């Protein structure tokens, strides 16, 4: 289906937890948060609060 979609959201999170939890070593600032875009900001959000509250 939503292939173009999909792969740029999974890529988009995959690097994003990269490189986020490798400088970042924690939880994100509304610094780096209001930087990203809306659709950017709510993946992000989305994944980090289901891996945050989840902790899986």
Do not use: H
């Not at 939880?27 to 609060?49: C, F, G, I, K």
């Amino acid at each position: 289906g939503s292939m173009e979609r999909l792969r740029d959201v999974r890529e988009r999170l995959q690097a994003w937890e990269r490189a986020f939890r490798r400088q970042r070593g924690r939880r994100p600032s509304q610094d780096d948060v209001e930087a990203a875009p809306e659709e950017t900001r709510a993946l992000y959000r989305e994944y980090r609060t289901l891996k945050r509250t989840t902790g899986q």
